[PDB]
Design a protein around this ligand. Structure first.
Ligand code: I63
Length: 128
């Protein structure tokens, strides 16, 4: 399924090149600009465990998710992944546990040692 496709085709966007965060650009966005540290970013996302089990979707709430980029306000794979995106881009991210919730998990929805899959659409971003 989609998580295995990221394993097979994803771009390694980690500084260490350890395959910890792999990315497929599903829809190329527009403009040259990517969001910068401290920007307010707006996304829609769907999250599942790598085995396909859904844990959350902002579409179900009709509620974009908003955060400040590059400040450790979200899991490492999101700060790394969203910084590579263009406005209007849709990507798939596969995140090894060390770039997600690691040993602690996010219990009960996310177990310890979980690889996570996210679909992310970068709706907008604005300087603080
Ligand atoms: C349980 C799964 C939830 C949390 C619902 C989920 O879908 C999810 O996994 N996320 C929500 C959308 C952004 C990615 C991801 C997320 O980062 O949520 C983070 C989880 C907490 C976290 C922050 C920083 C971290 O490292 C610097 C960190 O590492 C373990 C954990 C989160 C941020 C803000 C709000 C939030 O939940 C809603 C709330 O508390 O109101 C969850």
């Amino acid at each position: 399924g989609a998580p295995a496709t990221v394993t097979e085709q994803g771009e390694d966007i980690t500084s260490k090149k350890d395959r910890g965060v792999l990315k497929i650009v599903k829809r190329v966005g527009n403009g040259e600009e990517t969001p910068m540290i401290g920007d307010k970013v707006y996304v829609h996302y769907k999250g599942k465990l790598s085995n396909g089990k859904k844990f959350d979707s902002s579409h179900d709430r009709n509620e974009p998710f908003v955060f400040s980029l590059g400040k450790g306000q979200v899991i490492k794979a999101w700060d790394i992944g969203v910084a590579t995106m263009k406005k209007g881009e849709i990507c798939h991210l596969l995140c090894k546990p060390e770039y997600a919730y690691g040993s602690a998990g996010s219990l009960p929805k996310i177990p310890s040692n979980a690889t996570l899959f996210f679909e992310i659409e970068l709706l907008d971003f604005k300087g603080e």
